[PDB]
């Protein structure tokens, strides 16, 4: 198919979100980050592995 299948409007395939903030006690490591799902793009969270 060649119609209405690809955005061709300059969006990334892989997105790396640095944590908004991070704290690290001597027992656990906690990170918080805000991920923004574009304006029209959609993802399933089978992706988004923690690196």
């Amino acid at each position: 198919p060649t119609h209405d299948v690809t955005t061709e409007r300059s969006q990334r395939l892989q997105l790396r979100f640095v944590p908004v903030d991070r704290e690290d006690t001597q027992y656990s490591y906690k990170t918080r980050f805000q991920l923004a799902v574009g304006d029209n793009r959609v993802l399933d969270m089978a992706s988004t592995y923690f690196d």
Binding site: P1, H3, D4, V5
Partner: peptide, 16 residues
Amino acid sequence: NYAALAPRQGTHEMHG
């Protein structure tokens, strides 16, 4: 019609 998106050739998994 959604045939444009379809390529042109021409969930009961729960147990323990």
